[PDB]
Amino acid sequence: SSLDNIEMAYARQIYIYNEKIVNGHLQPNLVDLCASVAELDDKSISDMWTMVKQMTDVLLTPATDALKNRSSVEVRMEFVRQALAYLEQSYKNYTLVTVFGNLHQAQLGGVPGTYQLVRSFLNIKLPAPLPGLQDGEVEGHPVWALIYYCMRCGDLLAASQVVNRAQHQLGEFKTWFQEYMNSKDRRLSPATENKLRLHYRRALRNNTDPYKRAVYCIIGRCDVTDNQSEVADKTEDYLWLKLNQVCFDPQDRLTLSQFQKQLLEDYGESHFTVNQQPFLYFQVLFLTAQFEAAVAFLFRMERLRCHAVHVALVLFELKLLLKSSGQSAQLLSHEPGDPPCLRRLNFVRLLMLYTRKFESTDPREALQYFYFLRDEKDSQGENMFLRCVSELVIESREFDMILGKLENDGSRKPGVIDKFTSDTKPIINKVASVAENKGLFEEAAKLYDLAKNADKVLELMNKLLSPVVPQISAPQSNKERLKNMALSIAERYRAQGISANKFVDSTFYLLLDLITFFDEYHSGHIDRAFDIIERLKLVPLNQESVEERVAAFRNFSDEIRHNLSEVLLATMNILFTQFKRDRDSQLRSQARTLITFAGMIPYRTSGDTNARLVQMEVLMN
Amino acid sequence: ERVSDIYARLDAVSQQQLKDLTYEQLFSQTPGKELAKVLVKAIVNRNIAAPDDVVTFKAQEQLQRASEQAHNAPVLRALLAESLRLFEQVAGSLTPANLTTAVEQMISLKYYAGAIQLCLTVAQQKDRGNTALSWVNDGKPANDSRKKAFDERKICYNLIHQVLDKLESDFAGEPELVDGRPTLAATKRMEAYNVVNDSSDEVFHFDMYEWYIEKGWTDRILSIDSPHVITYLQRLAETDFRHAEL
Amino acid sequence: NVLDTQEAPFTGRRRKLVVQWIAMAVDMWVREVERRMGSWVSELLGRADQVLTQIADAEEIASLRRTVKGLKRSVD
DSSP states (O other): OOOOHHHHHHHHHHHHHHHHHHTTOOOOOHHHHHHHHHTTSOHHHHHHHHHHHHHHOSOOOTTOOHHHHHHOHHHHHHHHHHHHHHHHHHHHHHHHHHHSSSHHHHHHHOOOOHHHHHHHHHHHHOOSOOTTOOSOEETTEEHHHHHHHHHHHTOHHHHHHHHHTTHHHHTTHHHHHHHHHHSGGGOOOHHHHHHHHHHHHHHOSSOSOHHHHHHHHHHTTOOTTOOOTTTOOSHHHHHHHHHTTEEOOOOSOEEHHHHHHHHHHHSOHHHHSTTSOHHHHHHHHHTTTOHHHHHHHHHHSTTSHHHHHHHHHHHHTTTOSOBOSOTTSOSEEOOTTSOTTOOEEOHHHHHHHHHHHHTTTOHHHHHHHHGGGTTOBOTTOOBHHHHHHHHHHHHHOOHIIIIIOBOTTSOBOOOGGGGTOSOOHHHHHHHHHHHHHTTOHHHHHHHHHHTTOHHHHHHHHHHHHGGGSSSOOOTTOHHHHHHHHHHHHHHHHHHTTOOOOHHHHHHHHHHHHHHHHHHHHTTTOHHHHHHHHHHHTOSOOSGGGHHHHHHHHTTSOHHHHTTHHHHHHHHHHHHHHHHHOOHHHHHHHHHHHHHHHHHHOOOTTHHHHHHHHHHHHHHHO | OOHHHHHHTSOSHHHHHHHTOOHHHHHHOHHHHHHHHHHHHHHHHHHOOOHHHHHHHHHHHHHHHHHTSOOEHHHHHHHHHHHHHHHHHTGGGOOHHHHHHHHHHHHHTTOHHHHHHHHHHHHHHSOSSOHHHHHHTTTOOTTOSSHHHHHHHHHHHHHHHHHHHHHHHHTSBOOSEETTEEOHHHHHHHHHHHHHHTOOOHHHHHHHHHHHHHHTOHHHHTTOOOSHHHHHHHHHTTTOHHHHHO | OHHHHOOTTSOGGGHHHHHHHHHHHHHHHHHHHHHOOOHHHHHHHHHHHHHHHHHOOHHHHHHHHHHHHHHHHHHO
């Protein structure tokens, strides 16, 4: 097996999600089905899916195009809020593990109020007082530190409580903050927003209290260039600092498009992967709505291929992933007729790479991933899922497992693909078609016979029999192994009343009779073999039938005319033997008949055959 | 062919009609011709498991082989794409039983858009005069004989509901975006709903407004924009509270 | 070659029968390829359809158009 522990667990989860859609059940939450395995690994992966769920848990317009949802200002706004809610809660967990040694340890004693937690967080991260703080303290801590880390944790209420106990010190900041907490989308009114920004810009552009600076332009979304590096030293603190500063419809203003493009264009992977920590960059792209970038990026880490494919599937089963129309493009690209700030993922290629790894010895699991390509076609019109099953069968040669083995008793035990579509007639011909083009007739027959395509089964069975008609049928020979399959196809084609056009069909049952004629001839059962050839009315034995038999030879399958030489000789040698054992006249007359027939028929080795036939007739007299 | 295999997978009326079937009946009586049709139909929808009656068989054969695959985007997509191609050529002749089975098989192989496109095509072919649109625009007078034309479209529209239903079901919990770009589950949602909004069948869009209302999707219906939906409501308002509220 | 020239008796509404021949022939052709042709056959079947509309047995023709358009798909 080519699948690692993690990859295998995901496969099982994707089998469920397929079993549900294959039986018409409720469309379960894919993101939940993937996070179910994440908990079996380190929390590096669990915290990823947590971000994936929260970033995709946005009210969408079902049955709407992918590009439309992702271009709409409506959806683009909720992404920023879902991310900020993740950066705030994520930071809140950092503040817990900073005070208590373990999340469990914090829980048993009880998570304290965000206010008392933050206070018990300031104790550690600033033990001694910084001399540059302003506006005094509140219950033993600087008022601005409390406000910042409370807003950072996302509890505006806890921050407003701090403000209520410092009404005299904070001046007019109270009426401004109380408006920020009330107004939605973390924005103030243009009039009041103007009043505070100008005040900050007036004489507080450079204040000795960094926490004061941070809060002001987090509330006013100002000084976008100043990264407030004094307080936002971590990467998440930067993302959170900026997403609280982005704006929507000229100076000192930043928008999501600029920010998202500004980040990866100027400070690409190189900047965010110098510490050899891959998820850091992924979180930067995913929490900025650049899902295709983050997916391709994370898909290149050979250790995190599994995770990047699935986060792509989630975005794909939620009409959020922007697929690349052309299949000839690179993995990541920007369509020419699209805005430059969005990118597109060649989803077809993405799955095709992941599959090649474990498609060789783990076919069942491969199909589960090929199903997501059911909705796509190629330039030639083939259904992508169907084509992927053809290529996977041509390579793996797993016919019984994937296509269903058709035993020699008339049964068709369904295969693994039967689960996904009930119309399995084309691919069985596709797989049968190539194997036919590769001279693998004995297989192409079994495959065509699996799809009950007798036109092709009998055609190929005619080719495999004609060479072996006069041969000696011996144990385990190529004659027995082909005759016995032909008879197993004769019964199942009569018991089920199946037949190809009379040309193909007539020749097929005719060869089977001839194969019996030589099997009796090679055994010495002369009398019995003579009777068979007489029924077939293939070789004339009375002079009257020569005219009609000669005309019939003209339109009989060349697979029959080929073996005419051996038939005449065996029949002659049959009469020849019976002569040495009135009757003499009758054999003599029949001997003549064979000669005149052979004389009027142009066929294989007519030279040596016509001569031998005449000699055997002379010895009779 | 494999006979008893058919017989075992038959009805009882079909099994018992074959039991007492004489050659005389086969040769010169309708019930005998009818059963012959049933039997050939069974062996055709099994090797798939008049250029109209021939194509329909090959289409079932193509779709049956698709489901028998290991999932090869090239082979699966090819078979599916072709199956749809063929079915559409004989859309007007498709029976409710053949359409249902086909759609179900396509749904199982994640071919949602394709399934929907077939249903719409079949609806439009069984009524090119739009007898249904006029019958609805006339208040649906009982005793009229356009009802048949409307019913044959309603069978297609219902099957479209099942497709969209199974789609949201199959992808319940799946994210719309992974690592930034869209997943495969998301693109199939867009591709499917595209086919829906790309239609010009009016009885269909009426049936879909009613369907959205039923499922409770004020999300999408209030977001159409179009007056067409307003005008449709303006007629149905004085009639139902739920519609008037919309 | 018969359907274009329209030399008698292959004229007027009798060309409805010429299309029936073309449907039978081409149908037996694709059925003989799928058991085991180019643009010019698709060019014809589409051109054969103009004949059926140009002639518009009201139900026979209608059923025949849907047999032609079925073969055009089978070739393309």
